[PDB]
Amino acid sequence: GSVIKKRRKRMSKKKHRKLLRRTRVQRRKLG
Amino acid sequence: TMTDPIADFLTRLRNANSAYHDEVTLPHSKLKANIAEILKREGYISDYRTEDARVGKSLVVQLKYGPSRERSIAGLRRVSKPGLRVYAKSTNLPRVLGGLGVAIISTSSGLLTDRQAARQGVGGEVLAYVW
Amino acid sequence: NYIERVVSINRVSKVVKGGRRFSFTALVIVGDGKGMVGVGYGKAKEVPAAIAKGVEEARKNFFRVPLIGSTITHPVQGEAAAGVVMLRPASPGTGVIAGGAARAVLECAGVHDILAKSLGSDNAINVVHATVAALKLLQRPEEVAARRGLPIEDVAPAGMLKARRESE
Amino acid sequence: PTIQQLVRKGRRDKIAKVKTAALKGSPQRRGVCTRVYTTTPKKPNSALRKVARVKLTSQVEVTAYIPGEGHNLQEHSMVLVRGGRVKDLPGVRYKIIRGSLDTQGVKNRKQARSRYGAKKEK
Amino acid sequence: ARYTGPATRKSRRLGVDLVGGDQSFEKRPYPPGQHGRARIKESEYRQQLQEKQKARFSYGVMEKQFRRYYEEANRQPGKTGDNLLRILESRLDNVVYRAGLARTRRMARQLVSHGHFLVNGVKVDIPSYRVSQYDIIDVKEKSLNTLPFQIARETAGERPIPSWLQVVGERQRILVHQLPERAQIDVPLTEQLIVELYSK
RNA sequence: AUCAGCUUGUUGGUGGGGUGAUGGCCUACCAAGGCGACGACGGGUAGCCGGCCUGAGAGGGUGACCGGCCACACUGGGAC
RNA sequence: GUGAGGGAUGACGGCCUUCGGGUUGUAAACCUCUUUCAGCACAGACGAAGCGCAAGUGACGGUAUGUGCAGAAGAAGGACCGGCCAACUACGUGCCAGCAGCCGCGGUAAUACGUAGGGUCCGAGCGUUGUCCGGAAUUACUGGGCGUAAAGAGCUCGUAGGUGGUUUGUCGCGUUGUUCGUGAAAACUCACAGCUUAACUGUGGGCGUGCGGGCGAUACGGGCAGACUAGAGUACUGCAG
RNA sequence: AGUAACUGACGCUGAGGAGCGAAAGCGUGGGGAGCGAACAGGAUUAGAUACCCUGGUAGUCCACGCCGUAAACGGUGGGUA
RNA sequence: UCGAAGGUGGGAUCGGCGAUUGGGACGAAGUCGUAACAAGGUAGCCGUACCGGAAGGUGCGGCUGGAUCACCUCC
């Protein structure tokens, strides 16, 4: 299997983790 | 573990047939002997006999090949199996190879072929197909 | 008299430093309509030449189909590569019910009434191969009776027997 | 799967995507033109496609395509819209029926007249 | 409805003569129009469709009626091709034409539609009327002296009357012994092509 | 199940009452049961069927006319 | 039903052209024939072995229908023509105007746009939209898969469940045979009959794939009562890590 | 593995469920030589939040617990002939 | 006594709007950089942690779905 699919999935995962890091305190205070 | 002795018998026959063996041995039981009887009487196998084994008895089957080494059996399929079992009435008995094959049916009158069961007006469990 | 069926022309190409070199491939069927068929696959730089090579290849490789009057003896199912074609005999007057590749092969083979369906790999070459493989799985009743060493009436049903009678 | 797995879970068919949800089970709907304008298609093609913004009776705001050569649609014009997709335009699934209600049949049309609401010449 | 346009067009397009003795088809046996000479692409669908058009323009049957006939013929326990052919042949206008009482199928249909005939003692004016065994088709007494029947009754040397029909009276009575079989039909074209087309 | 617990006349008994009729149908007392992953309890949708359409068949969709059963008659209760 | 037969080195016009001519086209014009259906005139029902002890009684309806009269006389449109998928040329326009179910067509010479000739398919219809099934074996019971295409839980133990070696007897639960009752009619299918045919309607079978009762069978599955050791486990003696 | 002394089908799979489960990470208490995210300088570079060099804190180690993920791969579920 | 409707009360559950705010898809030609594919010029990817305008960098463990190994003298 091409590593292209792994690359797409990893970019999605990395962006989501970055978003989670950027809004940790906001999420904690809203929940 | 072993679940279907009948299917194991059929697969021993099929595997020996593909390998052009002249001989196939397996543990003996009444049902397997009756299936061997039907196969021999219908001319699919050469001959069968039952020796005795170390514990019980064995079944020995001679495979029939033509002069140019062409197999006398074209296929062997198990129809009714543990889990999903198949029963047919006397009127909707299956046809094998458009009638060119033989379907073995277990009726209360014993083991019969599809044509015998149709002629006698009986039904039962469809054990296997031979063609 | 021979009936020919050019079932597909394809333009294939190989790459070179200058560019693309296009050739032509033709899949043809050759038969007499009486029970003999053959399949050829020719390639050339020109379509008529490829057709000619396919025709001669199909003529060289012939194969007799076990007809019974106007149809095949018994249902079969043949598979070659990923193509799966199922064949089923039909009552007289039904006609050929098949797709383009199967229809070409069966009409060249002389089969008049048959139900045929393709169940995989719509590619024409492989469907033709699967149809030929299915037609090679048919057995005449005499051969079957010889195999099991039984009279022809014991093995075949009465339905097949008189169908041979009326045809003969 | 196994037969037992089948009797335990069964087979679930794929769900069907509903098309033209704004119609709400009707072959056609009547709307009023929120705005009539023009737009450019996808990249491979190029034109000035004529598109109307229609507010249907099913309370759905929908963008509809105007077939034919010339049209006489302006604001607050009652039209009858149907289903039909235009490949070039991204999110247009409806076309305005020519020759019904305010929208007029095209002019000087002599072939496929019934598809553009142009009467036979006398 | 009915087809009233030129007859030679259909013969030219289908590549065979359907009227039977027309000189225009022999003069130009190719399709009509500007492009009647262009070579055609070969397609099984085209051949099947042209066979069906031949059948339904020889007998003057429209498409819906032809489809009903095909369904009826398939439903019957014979074989589809000759069943369809026999159903087509059993029409009253076709019977009148094959009986030698009409030069062409169109005029046979016109005569039947005008009520010039009378089947089994009761007036029938229905070109699609189907004729059964031991049917007696008679010309009503008023129109026996008309010129069409006059020239029909004094030129009884044309196309032979098939076996399943027999003219017995000097007044040109028609008797139907049994519905025709495929052997005696004597029709152009191929029924198998129509059967193939209608199974698509 | 991105609805796991539900039930207290609720589960059973006895004596009464009630009904054309059996029955927690109602009632007094007594016992603590009853249902649920074989999906109870919730949420959504829906009149059911002979049939109809499609399909080679299995199956899928449907319940217009005609025919049978049910439910309702401005909304909600009630009896005569 | 809007007509039928005959009708030519194949009229005019249109359109294309290689400027020759070809196509519309037997089509037309003309010569005969027939009038279905409409129009006019005349007569005129069955449905009522009915109802009524009164003399009469049909809403439909003066309808259907039948007979005369006149004359081809009053009667054809829609979609499509790049491939799938029957059916191609010219002019106009030029990445526009537009088309399009998909592939995709518009860049001054488009068989894909617009219009005209021609053609094809249907025809009192022809197309468009909406919805369901088919094609789709694309939820695969019939009838699919999981190394790399989507798809084996990270690995075990184990609950409910599913499934189970050889053999004896018995039950007749499943299974199977037959018989009785039921499965309304209508519908469907087969045959016949009646409407001038058909649709439609009636009659008689089949179907109603099931369920309930009796009677028969015991190969297989299951239950019950046993037996065996080839599976499984224990024991003993060694062994490697 | 061998003997086969013993029981006499006691087998297989297993929804849910329970347990185990690299490394990183988290808690409490210890320990800390080397290595070393982060962080500092140096260099390279157009620019170097990198690659290379010099330092270097968590962590890596131990005890007791959490976590429950991996290219946890033979990308190949278990049993049998 | 029961009893519809009505009133009071505290909760369930389904939607709409919401100043502000997060990401997603698409958009010929804008800006910034070169991350991947040839050993892509530091092999790539998986889990995890930290850091950075951004692709990304680095540590620990894992996988190959990673390229090259010339000449090579005795037999």
PDB file of N, CA and C in Angstrom, chain C residues 117-149:
ATOM      1  N   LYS C 117     -25.395 -15.498 -18.457  1.00  0.00           N
ATOM      2  CA  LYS C 117     -25.218 -14.295 -17.663  1.00  0.00           C
ATOM      3  C   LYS C 117     -23.753 -14.160 -17.277  1.00  0.00           C
ATOM      4  N   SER C 118     -23.263 -12.925 -17.263  1.00  0.00           N
ATOM      5  CA  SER C 118     -21.910 -12.617 -16.822  1.00  0.00           C
ATOM      6  C   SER C 118     -21.966 -12.034 -15.417  1.00  0.00           C
ATOM      7  N   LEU C 119     -21.131 -12.558 -14.520  1.00  0.00           N
ATOM      8  CA  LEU C 119     -21.193 -12.205 -13.107  1.00  0.00           C
ATOM      9  C   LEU C 119     -19.849 -11.730 -12.566  1.00  0.00           C
ATOM     10  N   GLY C 120     -19.073 -11.020 -13.377  1.00  0.00           N
ATOM     11  CA  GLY C 120     -17.827 -10.459 -12.894  1.00  0.00           C
ATOM     12  C   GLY C 120     -16.841 -10.125 -13.992  1.00  0.00           C
ATOM     13  N   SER C 121     -16.006  -9.112 -13.760  1.00  0.00           N
ATOM     14  CA  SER C 121     -14.939  -8.732 -14.685  1.00  0.00           C
ATOM     15  C   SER C 121     -15.494  -8.458 -16.084  1.00  0.00           C
ATOM     16  N   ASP C 122     -16.216  -7.342 -16.178  1.00  0.00           N
ATOM     17  CA  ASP C 122     -16.855  -6.939 -17.426  1.00  0.00           C
ATOM     18  C   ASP C 122     -15.885  -6.789 -18.593  1.00  0.00           C
ATOM     19  N   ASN C 123     -14.578  -6.926 -18.368  1.00  0.00           N
ATOM     20  CA  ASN C 123     -13.616  -6.867 -19.462  1.00  0.00           C
ATOM     21  C   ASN C 123     -13.940  -7.930 -20.506  1.00  0.00           C
ATOM     22  N   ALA C 124     -13.949  -7.518 -21.776  1.00  0.00           N
ATOM     23  CA  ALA C 124     -14.444  -8.385 -22.842  1.00  0.00           C
ATOM     24  C   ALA C 124     -13.551  -9.602 -23.051  1.00  0.00           C
ATOM     25  N   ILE C 125     -12.231  -9.414 -22.998  1.00  0.00           N
ATOM     26  CA  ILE C 125     -11.309 -10.523 -23.233  1.00  0.00           C
ATOM     27  C   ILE C 125     -11.516 -11.615 -22.195  1.00  0.00           C
ATOM     28  N   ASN C 126     -11.595 -11.223 -20.925  1.00  0.00           N
ATOM     29  CA  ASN C 126     -11.753 -12.211 -19.870  1.00  0.00           C
ATOM     30  C   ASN C 126     -13.143 -12.829 -19.879  1.00  0.00           C
ATOM     31  N   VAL C 127     -14.164 -12.073 -20.283  1.00  0.00           N
ATOM     32  CA  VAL C 127     -15.494 -12.660 -20.399  1.00  0.00           C
ATOM     33  C   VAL C 127     -15.517 -13.711 -21.503  1.00  0.00           C
ATOM     34  N   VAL C 128     -14.842 -13.438 -22.621  1.00  0.00           N
ATOM     35  CA  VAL C 128     -14.743 -14.435 -23.684  1.00  0.00           C
ATOM     36  C   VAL C 128     -13.998 -15.668 -23.190  1.00  0.00           C
ATOM     37  N   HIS C 129     -12.897 -15.461 -22.462  1.00  0.00           N
ATOM     38  CA  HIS C 129     -12.150 -16.595 -21.922  1.00  0.00           C
ATOM     39  C   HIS C 129     -13.008 -17.419 -20.972  1.00  0.00           C
ATOM     40  N   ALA C 130     -13.788 -16.753 -20.121  1.00  0.00           N
ATOM     41  CA  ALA C 130     -14.644 -17.465 -19.178  1.00  0.00           C
ATOM     42  C   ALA C 130     -15.756 -18.218 -19.895  1.00  0.00           C
ATOM     43  N   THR C 131     -16.310 -17.634 -20.959  1.00  0.00           N
ATOM     44  CA  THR C 131     -17.318 -18.341 -21.742  1.00  0.00           C
ATOM     45  C   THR C 131     -16.734 -19.590 -22.385  1.00  0.00           C
ATOM     46  N   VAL C 132     -15.515 -19.487 -22.913  1.00  0.00           N
ATOM     47  CA  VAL C 132     -14.864 -20.655 -23.495  1.00  0.00           C
ATOM     48  C   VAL C 132     -14.582 -21.703 -22.423  1.00  0.00           C
ATOM     49  N   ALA C 133     -14.164 -21.263 -21.235  1.00  0.00           N
ATOM     50  CA  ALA C 133     -13.915 -22.193 -20.139  1.00  0.00           C
ATOM     51  C   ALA C 133     -15.195 -22.902 -19.713  1.00  0.00           C
ATOM     52  N   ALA C 134     -16.317 -22.182 -19.705  1.00  0.00           N
ATOM     53  CA  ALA C 134     -17.596 -22.809 -19.389  1.00  0.00           C
ATOM     54  C   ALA C 134     -17.999 -23.809 -20.462  1.00  0.00           C
ATOM     55  N   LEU C 135     -17.833 -23.442 -21.734  1.00  0.00           N
ATOM     56  CA  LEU C 135     -18.176 -24.360 -22.815  1.00  0.00           C
ATOM     57  C   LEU C 135     -17.271 -25.583 -22.816  1.00  0.00           C
ATOM     58  N   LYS C 136     -16.072 -25.460 -22.251  1.00  0.00           N
ATOM     59  CA  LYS C 136     -15.183 -26.606 -22.132  1.00  0.00           C
ATOM     60  C   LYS C 136     -15.516 -27.489 -20.940  1.00  0.00           C
ATOM     61  N   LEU C 137     -16.453 -27.076 -20.088  1.00  0.00           N
ATOM     62  CA  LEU C 137     -16.898 -27.886 -18.965  1.00  0.00           C
ATOM     63  C   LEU C 137     -18.105 -28.753 -19.296  1.00  0.00           C
ATOM     64  N   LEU C 138     -18.665 -28.624 -20.496  1.00  0.00           N
ATOM     65  CA  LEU C 138     -19.810 -29.437 -20.881  1.00  0.00           C
ATOM     66  C   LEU C 138     -19.376 -30.858 -21.207  1.00  0.00           C
ATOM     67  N   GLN C 139     -20.219 -31.822 -20.846  1.00  0.00           N
ATOM     68  CA  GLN C 139     -19.960 -33.232 -21.097  1.00  0.00           C
ATOM     69  C   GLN C 139     -21.142 -33.840 -21.834  1.00  0.00           C
ATOM     70  N   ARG C 140     -20.859 -34.532 -22.931  1.00  0.00           N
ATOM     71  CA  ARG C 140     -21.905 -35.243 -23.646  1.00  0.00           C
ATOM     72  C   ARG C 140     -22.395 -36.419 -22.805  1.00  0.00           C
ATOM     73  N   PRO C 141     -23.677 -36.779 -22.905  1.00  0.00           N
ATOM     74  CA  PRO C 141     -24.178 -37.906 -22.104  1.00  0.00           C
ATOM     75  C   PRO C 141     -23.462 -39.213 -22.385  1.00  0.00           C
ATOM     76  N   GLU C 142     -23.040 -39.445 -23.631  1.00  0.00           N
ATOM     77  CA  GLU C 142     -22.326 -40.676 -23.951  1.00  0.00           C
ATOM     78  C   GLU C 142     -21.006 -40.756 -23.200  1.00  0.00           C
ATOM     79  N   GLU C 143     -20.277 -39.641 -23.126  1.00  0.00           N
ATOM     80  CA  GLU C 143     -19.027 -39.619 -22.377  1.00  0.00           C
ATOM     81  C   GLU C 143     -19.268 -39.894 -20.899  1.00  0.00           C
ATOM     82  N   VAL C 144     -20.348 -39.340 -20.343  1.00  0.00           N
ATOM     83  CA  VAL C 144     -20.673 -39.586 -18.941  1.00  0.00           C
ATOM     84  C   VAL C 144     -20.975 -41.063 -18.716  1.00  0.00           C
ATOM     85  N   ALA C 145     -21.807 -41.646 -19.581  1.00  0.00           N
ATOM     86  CA  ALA C 145     -22.158 -43.053 -19.430  1.00  0.00           C
ATOM     87  C   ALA C 145     -20.932 -43.941 -19.582  1.00  0.00           C
ATOM     88  N   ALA C 146     -20.011 -43.561 -20.468  1.00  0.00           N
ATOM     89  CA  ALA C 146     -18.754 -44.287 -20.584  1.00  0.00           C
ATOM     90  C   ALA C 146     -17.942 -44.180 -19.301  1.00  0.00           C
ATOM     91  N   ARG C 147     -17.910 -42.990 -18.696  1.00  0.00           N
ATOM     92  CA  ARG C 147     -17.113 -42.791 -17.490  1.00  0.00           C
ATOM     93  C   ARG C 147     -17.596 -43.674 -16.348  1.00  0.00           C
ATOM     94  N   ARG C 148     -18.906 -43.740 -16.139  1.00  0.00           N
ATOM     95  CA  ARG C 148     -19.469 -44.533 -15.057  1.00  0.00           C
ATOM     96  C   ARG C 148     -19.827 -45.949 -15.481  1.00  0.00           C
ATOM     97  N   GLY C 149     -19.616 -46.302 -16.745  1.00  0.00           N
ATOM     98  CA  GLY C 149     -19.874 -47.652 -17.205  1.00  0.00           C
ATOM     99  C   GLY C 149     -21.320 -48.074 -17.054  1.00  0.00           C
TER     100      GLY C 149
END
